[PDB]
Each structure stands twice: as C-alpha cells, then as structure tokens.
Symmetry: none
Subunit: 217 residues, 4 copies
Amino acid sequence: MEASVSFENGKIVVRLPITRPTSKIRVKKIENGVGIPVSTRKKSFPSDENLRDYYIEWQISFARDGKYDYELSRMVRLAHEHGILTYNDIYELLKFADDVKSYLEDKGIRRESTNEELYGFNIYEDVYPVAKKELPSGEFIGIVLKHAQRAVGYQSMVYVCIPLTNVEPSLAGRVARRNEVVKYEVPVDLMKELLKAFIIASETHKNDIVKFLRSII
Amino acid sequence: MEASVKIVVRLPITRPTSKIRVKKIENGVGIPVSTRKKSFPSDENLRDYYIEWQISFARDGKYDYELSRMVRLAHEHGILTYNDIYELLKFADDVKSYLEDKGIRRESTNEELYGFNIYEDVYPVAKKELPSGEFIGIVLKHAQRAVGYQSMVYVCIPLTNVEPSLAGRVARRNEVVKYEVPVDLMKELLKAFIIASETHKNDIVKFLRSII
Amino acid sequence: MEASVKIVVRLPITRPTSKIRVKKIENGVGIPVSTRKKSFPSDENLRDYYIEWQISFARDGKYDYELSRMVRLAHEHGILTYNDIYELLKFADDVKSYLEDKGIRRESTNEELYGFNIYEDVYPVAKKELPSGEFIGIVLKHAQRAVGYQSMVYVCIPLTNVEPSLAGRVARRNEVVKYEVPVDLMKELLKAFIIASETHKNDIVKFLRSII
Amino acid sequence: MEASVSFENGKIVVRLPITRPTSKIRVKKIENGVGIPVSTRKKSFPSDENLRDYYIEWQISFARDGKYDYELSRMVRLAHEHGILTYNDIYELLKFADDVKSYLEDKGIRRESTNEELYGFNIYEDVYPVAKKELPSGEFIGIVLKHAQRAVGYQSMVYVCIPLTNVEPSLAGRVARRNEVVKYEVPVDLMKELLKAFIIASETHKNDIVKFLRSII
DNA sequence: GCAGTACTTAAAGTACTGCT
DNA sequence: GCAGTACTTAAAGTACTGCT
C-alpha cells in the first residue's frame, strides 16, 4: 500500500489511508504518553478536545529499489520542480549534511546486564536509542534504530506523527469511511526536517540524501 | 503452520516466517538462516545454529496446544508427578513480580543530535539456559490494539540437539526434525509463563489445578 | 499441476511455470503476466490477455487426460456424433504431410560478424484462429534425449472468454477460471495433433477408432 | 550448479561436470550435424574415433547480479592477475569493442509468412539468428539470440562447445563416474574469442565487457 | 525414493481490522 | 468468507537422468 503524493495549489499534499491499521500508515491515540492504535471503523472519532491526542503515525521511507522515486523522494522532487523547495533550501541541506559526522546509529543497541533476577531467570535490559523532534506546526519526527533483520548491523527508520487537526476533512465526531484516505498539506519545513532526520539517522541514509540532493541541483 | 507433539515434538525448519524458525548466532545476534540455499556447517560452527520457537500455552480457550499438550501428556505418563505439579503450583503462589511489571521505559537523556532530542527505550527480557543447551527467553511488547503489555515465551533449541544431523547438508522440502523434550524443559517453560505476567500465571495455575 | 475438466474445463491462472500460464500481447509477443501483483485492465487492453495451455493428448498410456477426456466425454453426450468421428478419421487418412516433416533447418548465410559466420535457424509453426477468438498453435522442437523432433500443441484462450471477468482486479490465490470449450475447438485440437506428426496421428486414430 | 574456476601451472582451468545433463553444462554427441545429449552414466563413452563427435556444450555467462565475478569474468580476472592475459591483450580487446558497431541482436527474430498451408492450418517460419566460430584448438563458440522471457526485447546467450579430446582425463571406452567433473585447460585465445563473442552479441553485453576490461586496466 | 538442474512468480506465514 | 498489510524465504512447476 502506498500513499498518493501530489502537488496542488502551491502545496505538496499526500493522501493518507486511515482504515489500514496494519500498514506503515496507522492512526494512533496517545494514552499517558504511549501511542495506541485505533480501530477507525468501529470506534467513531471524538467530537471534542481529546482529538489532538489522536494522530497519524507514518513510517516514511526515502529510497526504494536503489531509486529515489518513493514517498519522501517523490515529495521532495515535486517540491523542487514547483519551486516549493528552492536552490538555497537544497544548498543549506547539503551543507548541513557535510557538517554532520555523528549519527543515531552510532548509539548502537546494547543488552545490559542487571543485578536483578526473576525467580531463577536472569534479567537483561535491551536499550534501543530513538530520536524525536517536535515541529511548531504540530507534527513529530521520530527516528528509531533497530537490528537489521536479514544481516548484521543496524537499520534506522524515520517516523512522522501527524496530529489529526493538521489534516482535512475534519473527522471530529464521526467514524472513518470505507477506504477513506485523508488529505495532508505538507509544510516545506517538515520536508526539510524529514531530510535532516534521514541525514542524521545513519551514514548510509545521509549518502542517499546527499546523492539525491546533488542530482536535483 | 503447526508442530506435531518421552515427549517428542516435530519441528518444521523450512518456514522462516513461522513461530518456528532456524537461526544462527552471527556477531552475537540471531540471524535468519536460508536452510535450503546454504549447507549447514559440519564443523564446530553448527553449535551456533538453533531453532527459535515462539511457543504458546493455550489455543481455542482449551489447554491442548503445544506446551499445555506436552505437560498434560507428560503428567499422564507419570513423567510429571503430583509433586512436580505441586512444586509448580507452589512456585506460582510464591511469585509476586513478573517481567511485565518492569514494563517498557523511555528514559529521557540530556543529549541532542543536531536539534533532535535523544531518548533510550529499555525493553526487559528474562533469559534462562538449561544444562543441555536450550535457552528460554521471555520478552515484553506493548499490547497491540490495547493499552498494556504482552509477554511472549521463546525456546531456543540447538541444532545439535535435534535429529537428523544437518551437518554438511541443506534442509529438505517441508523438512521436520526430531527433538525429544527434556522434562526440566517442560517445567522451566511453565515457570517462564508463570513469571511472564499475572495473566499468564493465573492461566498456568488454572491448567495445573485441572490435572492435579 | 492439473486442470479439472457442454464440456467445461477449470484452468489455474496463478501458476506461470505450468503448462497453463496467463500471458498478454506486448509488442506482438506473448509475455508472462504477474496475475497477483498487477490488476488486469478493465478497458480494451483486456483482449490482449490470454491463457496459454500446452495441452496434451494422453497420459499413463490411456486416453483419459485433458483433450482425450474432453473428446470422449463429448462424444458420449451426443455432442460429438459418429459422423464427427468419421470426418476426423477420414481427415486423418487424407493427411500425408505433418509439421515435423518440415523439421528445423539451419540455413547457412554469406555474412560475417567480425570473424563469426552468421546462420539462421528456421522453426516451423502451425497456427489456426477460431471465430470465437481462440488460437491453436503447433510448434516443433528437437527431440530432447534422442535424434528426431517433438511437436507440441498449444491452445490460447482470451481472458474475455473465461469467467469470472478479471477486469480491474488481481487474480485470487489458487484462482481457477470458468471456460466452456466450444465443440469445434475440440475437433480442431484433434486435427492439430493429427497434423503435428505421424506419431501423434496414429495416436489420435487409435483413440478415435476406440470410441467409434 | 557452477563450474569450478582455478589457476594452476600457468593455465586457467575449469572443472566441468559431465553427469548433469539438465544443467548449462551438458555432454552432447553430434548425429548428422545436430547436437544430441548423452546419458553419460548409462551409455559408456566409445573407445574409438567417434569420440570427437562427442563434446561438452557450455552456456557460458559473463555477469551475475550486476557483478563480474562469475564464470567468464572469473576466468578473465584470474588470467589477468597471473599475467596470462596481458595489457596489450586487454588493450586490443577494447579497441576491437570500440570499432564494433553492428551486433548479432541487430538481426532480430522474425516470423515470416508462407505460401504453405497444412490442411487448414496457417504455416509460419520463425527465423532465429545464430553466430558460430571454430577455433584452431578444436572448440566452437556459438551465439544464439532468443526473446527476453519476462520482458520485450532480445537476450543473447554465448555457448562454447569443447571436444572431449580437449579435456582430461580420457573418458574413452568408459562410463562417467558419480559426480565426475572434468578438467579443461582454457587456452588464452579462447578467452579472447569468448570476450569477442560477448562484444558482438549485443550492445548491452559489449558495455559489460568494456566496463569490466577498463576496470582491470 | 528423491534430488539435480533451471528460473521466476506465487505461496507460506502471523494476526486484526476491514473489505466486498 | 476473504482480503489488506507487511516482508522474505521456500515452494510450485516440467521432465530425465542421476544421486544416496
């Protein structure tokens, strides 16, 4: 499943499905600081203030099949072609990438021994590093580090969490519709911060951002 | 996919997406193995290979699936005695703390990565090794769909401890291996569930009270 | 893989390695279609899609497989009459030339590609279209393992002529389609085998003499 | 299944299995100008002159997974590293590739209409182009053009046919052994002609040979 | 009795919503 | 009753030798 990426009225917009809770685009609601997924077709969204606690969590990627024609790379290229992302915008990004030399993957994942025991069972603490940044427009950008599945080493994944108040139409006080996708106008600052997130996530991601940004300049 | 269960269990080794998957230790982490493209080593590296079984306790509300089936079929044979059940039931009554009580923590840290606040997520795991080489793992995960936690029990069986020997050989199609379950593995698996969470414990206690 | 056989045959469409595979005309050539990743078009391009069946006549020495099963099950129902069989048997007695008689030729040519002599291999094919849109192909190949030739009969059925309609949709898992075999398709398939080679012809004549 | 490529005593040698008749390495015997495969474990090779009619037909490739570490590229690189293929050898090859501008795939594959009919069935002739070259050492080099399986366009495959008299041990008058592979010392001239065959086969293959030859120079 | 060989798509697999 | 979603290996498939 893919989100539709488009340009309209001077804005990059993407259409996010809200009835696919097992996809990389899922609607969550925070209860006491943790995100919990939401059945958008059985539970009908609240018509009140607790709606801000609801948000869309999107695991956003940059590259696919070694090409930069996927999600964030499609948004950035469209933003470039319609003058939404300027020359100085891209120039500032590459000078930021040239100065970045420590990455989120440098923190690693570690299993720490404990002085604790559970009725004969040894107790360990697996420590995973994450990076989080809140933007003034309301969105959150997350970077988590996990183990590479099929090989040794780490892989870093970027998340963006979009408050439901930042998308249209207003779902307040109603249940999602069948195959309902939602329109989200992407601020340029979020695209720059998303590219920043990939730059600092790992050296592998940075080289992908750099090679892509240099190709459109 | 299901496994068919001196208690004997037959484990599929050609389904890496299952709850039962072949792995090998590489750089200290479990890595999926392509059991049909790669010949298993015949040297000492074979000890690095193991079968990881995400073992369950119940299914369809009744206690006749995997571990609950082993334990009842073992207790019936006199393999697990009345005192074996009392000890586990006594052990369960002694248990207050569970791994879920530790929970998952996001500890704030005072470092910044180019305008990004850095945090650390702390996931707790219980681990126990048995003299014959098997490992029992208990891992904590956020309760999917709901608020809370979900605990899962894993058993890791070295490929050395199953028949036939896979050394110098690629696995066969729908290949299933012989593993004789040691008695203490069954009891340690139950104690793993008893300490996983109160929910699992009351579930284990209800089953052990049923056959005692 | 096998297909289950007004004569009705059920054809699997999610097995592109089979004798029965879904194809589409692209640049004038049959191209395998990924029936589960790609939604079939709902527009006029659907006519470009077809099922290619490498159909056989016999199996296990007896004539109750695919075409031989259709023909006997059709002849029994009165669908194929005695005169229908005589005409095919008469047609077979009229046939002298077969596609195998053409053989595969390597014609020498007087051109050189940077020190390499260029040749041309000439493979003969028999092709027939039926008014309802199906095609019958006969192709020649070197007899594998032995000296000689081997002839194979193909039938190409447009996706328009099968149910349900696959338009605007990806195929289902182990999906099988409805195809009602027209009577003249059965008779033209037999004539295809009769003209493929003397070996096939005597094979067809032996079967038609058995049910007449 | 892969053939073992090695260097020994100043020679590039490859070990060719002779009991895998369904692989890309198969033992054939010519009967009246066509190659026919041979069951090397039931039929015991002749102890006479008709042994020359027996040969090993090897569909040899150059690249695998976009890398040049496979079959012919492994033989050529080893030949390079042990001074079997010299600088002038590789230089002459690239100047030959720079001059080649017509390819075997330029002949195309065509279905020709006929004035012939087979009892109501239309008759066509499918014409496939092949290229063949005999070398003084006895081997034959073949290039056949076929249709690309999963896509439109052509793909060209190179064959080399090795007389059994050119390999050791002598299989004369005996049946092949279980898992028997056979030692074939590769003349340098055949490697150059094999690279030539890939150069003239298609423009796609030539760019692969050129990029590989320039990388080892 | 079964693999070897070739090559690519479709299937297996886990688990809840959600779709038609 | 079944797909949607995620992702990767193993299975399907054709047909004869050949292997263990």
